[PDB]
Swiss-Prot record, chains A, B:
HAMAP family: G6P_isomerase (MF_00473)
Protein purpose: In the cytoplasm, catalyzes the conversion of glucose-6-phosphate to fructose-6-phosphate, the second step in glycolysis, and the reverse reaction during gluconeogenesis. Besides it's role as a glycolytic enzyme, also acts as a secreted cytokine: acts as an angiogenic factor (AMF) that stimulates endothelial cell motility. Acts as a neurotrophic factor, neuroleukin, for spinal and sensory neurons. It is secreted by lectin-stimulated T-cells and induces immunoglobulin secretion.
InterPro entries for this protein: G6P_Isomerase, G6P_Isomerase_C, Phosphoglucose_isomerase_CS, SIS_dom_sf, SIS_PGI_1, SIS_PGI_2
CDD domains documented for this protein: SIS_PGI_1 (cd05015), SIS_PGI_2 (cd05016)
Gene this chain is encoded by: GPI
Gene3D superfamilies tied to this protein: 1.10.1390.10, Glucose-6-phosphate isomerase like protein, domain 1
Primary localization class, coarse: cytoplasm
Protein name: Glucose-6-phosphate isomerase
Organism lineage: Eukaryota, Metazoa, Chordata, Craniata, Vertebrata
Effect of mutating residue 5 to I: In CNSHA4; GPI Matsumoto
Length: 557, 557
């Protein structure tokens, strides 16, 4: 019995689910209350665009929403929120604070950990990034044969990769006068090799992104990259003009060969999957400039305040969270789809796949007790409308309930054909949620078939296949425009959604022990791969696999 | 009661699961049988590389596998298979043959549809494709100012987009001498605009890829591209030199303005999500050569044959399929992860996200009655090792059971650092499945913390967070090298996997009625977006959203 299954509010929610489940049909709910949208949507004015969070197409009623909020009061969301913002060490297994919110604390209101304000160091690195960006973008910083940097290569994996990648992709329109950026992460040699084959070492700046500076993929890639650079430059000292580091580890950085002046620092309280707001975002600032980088932080700060001062019942990240809890712990849905109707946000689903799953794919509570209820869902998605032709078929006519977040900006970065393309995009965005809610009844489909001139025969054989049972809930999140500021607010909104979920589940959203085992095991297998000798030191699958690898290494095809 | 649940073999399986599941533990199954790898693996020799399908780390015993095969027999998988290969119209709701096998039928064994061998029309398109490829790649085909083609842009969405995208990404190394390829698909203007901006119309060839040639996203992008092309060449006759079509609808192609000679055709028996093998695959052929395309087709041809002639119990796609049924229909897993340890295969999960989900995201059986069991799972994934740092945390220590397929080629296309990158990638590939299988007990974790010097209070608090329950099942799919041939075989292998599941569930994997409702509703909405009047014709949410979009399209941020 974990804290969540023991919570009376939680119990009350389950009870209600058992009793009224059948009473939750959207088409009826929307026919019965013409004011639904007005009662179940949030309109937020940031002063830099609006955000509409329309949760009306969800399987909920006021009564449900009330209990969901009560669950949050009962699980202590506010108090937990304050501990985070006050620099308390809520990452209780690592003994750490969780301060991504300090990285964008534009107010500079002091935040203390161990009785010491962090804003100065935070601001000191921001000033370093900023100067460095100016110098690189303007051409003041030159390579070893005196050329300006045309290409910047972030080398990192996970948290030291996905954020900078997703954000430079989403804000590509703001990169005029920026060097190109490349993201190398996989250990798979293809990644580094097909990237290096497209660069001139003279004009390439490598950024080695690593919190620990010991991660195997990143270090090997860094080393590989350094070796290629020296093949061309030959002089160790040229490295200082082409390699810089984003890390917390001055020593490992000093030993890799990087100039201590070339290290942009962050802190143990900056989680990787929460790190783009820090020195890790360097590549973002190089690409779109430091002012736009400041705009991104600044949008996170805005959402940070909203999370902090808004009553739970109207609080955006809190509501997205609770709806998730409703669907995960009462309805049992394993997944959550994130579907941005925006090509620029093509890695947005993937970024939150890491952010959500790495934070809440947990099973041990603060008391050290195994949970007896679900935790985080599997998160996935592709941008619309492409998905409409790929997997929406199953979302519409399969056997899974899939809560979905539809997102879109009102204004496109590219209003071609007098806005016709955006017009269509918007139309599909609106249409797909309508359809998923509404469905199409036997009779509706029947009337369609009659009007089409089908025989009662062909009609009878086809009829049942054109029926949509509807009642698939979605959220619709609409924003004026996708600028650096608005993106920051959005990214921040899901983060805090994730936090809330985690406090409700009594888990630690900020550690990630789950990665160790494979690593340890990887280190064991590496030396076992060299040589022709068969391997018998594991379970028979691992050996068989290894022996097939050795045998096939020799095949000519 | 659907065909599956009424079926006796299935009832036996459920019954076995009900009574034995508590005994399904990988550590113990492996400790008790040193022959498990030999007994639960398949090694196939294609004569162009070997495929080891290792399914020994699955929660199955000999009895379970025996009952699953029985189920395939009882459900009629072989007859169904034959009906497909013989041209029968098993795509019953549209009255269509399903013949993606005919497109890569290198044996030219006649395959008849309504009494006509289709092989000649298939081979004529192929010869035609080949002649075009040779003229385009060699420089013979000039643009409107006498320049050779340097860039090819495929315009299409879904089935006319993903395959060729995936395949070109995957075979990038075979593209020496080929023109660059670009894939425009989303209606979002960002896509065509950001692409056109990087193109010279004198050297760019467009391919409008569309089975129907009326899909809105595709025709519009096509119009946008044609308009853009015309602004520079100012000569309607130049279109013939820069625009070809891949479609089954000659009429609408003539209407669009594409010369009938510039039309590469296909047929209705080719499903979209099964079309890359056809004329839809022209961009593939352009990029890496007709020779390589041919190799892609034979690899698939080989797998078709393997699928057709191998007894069930040793048939790769059938076994993949049965394992899935077992996890879906007994265990209840909603998802299936595909995790290729290959950066070239970075779109592979996405491709089968469509192929699997669009095929078997269904709830209506052949008799026309609602299924009363689960069908298709949600498919998802990202290449390793990136995942180890993102969502693997959830796979290892969350609360969901997630069958995963790990794939890797033994031989890398880029053996840099004398193979060091590839050695590590393999080590991780191997160790991750070992770890999901084994876990790490409390006892084991304690010993590691004690050995690390942690205090009793340090160790006590951390210990349970470090425990891995294990028993997480995986398949490992290992193949000699990712050549065009092997790729064809692997894509074909999952294609037939999906087919088998579809047959077992008694659904139609080859229709997709689920896209219609949205399409209808978007046509309605388009016109209402024009102008600034409030809309009140839909449900309140659809209304509020439209109105909010109208309010905000005129905000200056
Ligand atoms: O995503 C997980 C971590 O961010 C990833 O393992 C990289 O860690 P690092 O920043 O220490 O290299
Ligand atoms: O995947 C679905 C179809 O392939 C897609 O809607 C495109 O259809 P089309 O090729 O006729 O344009």
């Amino acid at each position: 019995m974990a804290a969540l299954t023991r919570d009376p509010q939680f119990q009350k929610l389950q009870q209600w689910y058992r009793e009224h489940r059948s009473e939750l049909n959207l088409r009826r709910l929307f026919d019965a209350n013409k004011d639904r949208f007005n009662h179940f949507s949030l309109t937020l004015n940031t002063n830099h665009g609006h955000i509409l969070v329309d949760y009306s197409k969800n399987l909920v009623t006021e009564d449900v929403m009330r209990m969901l909020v009560d669950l949050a009061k009962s699980r202590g969301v506010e108090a937990a929120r304050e501990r985070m913002f006050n620099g308390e060490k809520i990452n209780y297994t690592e003994g750490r604070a969780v301060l991504h919110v300090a990285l964008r604390n534009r107010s500079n209101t002091p935040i203390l950990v161990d009785g010491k304000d962090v804003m100065p160091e935070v601001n000191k690195v921001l000033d370093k990034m900023k100067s460095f960006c100016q110098r690189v973008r303007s051409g003041d910083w030159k390579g070893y044969t005196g050329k300006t940097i045309t290409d910047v290569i972030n080398i990192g994996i996970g948290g030291s990769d996905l954020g900078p990648l997703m954000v430079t992709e989403a804000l590509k329109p703001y990169s005029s006068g920026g060097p190109r950026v490349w993201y190398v992460s996989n250990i798979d040699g293809t990644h580094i090799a097909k990237t290096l084959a497209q660069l001139n070492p003279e004009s390439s700046l490598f950024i080695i992104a690593s919190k620990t500076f010991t991660t195997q993929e990143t270090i090997t890639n860094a080393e590989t990259a350094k070796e290629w650079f020296l093949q061309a430059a030959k002089d160790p000292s040229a490295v200082a003009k082409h390699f810089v580091a984003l890390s917390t580890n001055t020593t490992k950085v000093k030993e890799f060969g990087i100039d201590p002046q070339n290290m942009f620092e962050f802190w143990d309280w900056v989680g990787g999957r929460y790190s783009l707001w820090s020195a890790i975002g360097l590549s973002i600032a190089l690409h779109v400039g430091f002012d736009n980088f400041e705009q991104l932080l600044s949008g996170a700060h805005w959402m940070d305040q909203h999370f902090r001062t808004t009553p739970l019942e109207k609080n955006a990240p809190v509501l997205l969270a609770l709806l998730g809890i409703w669907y995960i712990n009462c309805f049992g849905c394993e997944t959550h789809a994130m579907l941005p109707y925006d090509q620029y946000l093509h890695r947005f689903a993937a970024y939150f796949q890491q952010g959500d799953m790495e934070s809440n794919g947990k099973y041990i509570t603060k008391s050290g007790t195994r949970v007896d209820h679900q935790t985080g869902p599997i998160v996935w998605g592709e941008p619309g409308t492409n998905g409409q032709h790929a997997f929406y078929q199953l979302i519409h006519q399969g056997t899974k309930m899939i809560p979905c977040d539809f997102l879109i900006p009102v204004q496109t970065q590219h209003p071609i054909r007098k806005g016709l393309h955006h017009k269509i995009l918007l139309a599909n965005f609106l249409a797909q949620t309508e359809a998923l809610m509404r469905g199409k009844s036997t009779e509706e489909a029947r009337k369609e078939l009659q009007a089409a001139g089908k025989s009662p025969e062909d009609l009878e054989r086809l009829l049942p296949h054109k029926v949509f049972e509807g009642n698939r809930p979605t959220n619709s999140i609409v924003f004026t425009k996708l600028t650096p500021f608005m993106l920051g607010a959005l990214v921040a909104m899901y983060e805090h959604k994730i936090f809330v979920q985690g406090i409700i589940w009594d888990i630690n959203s900020f550690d990630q022990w789950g990665v160790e085992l494979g690593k340890q095991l990887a280190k064991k297998i590496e030396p076992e791969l060299d040589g022709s000798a068969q391997v018998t030191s594991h379970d028979a699958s691992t050996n068989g696999l290894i022996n097939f690898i050795k045998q096939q290494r020799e095949a000519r095809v």
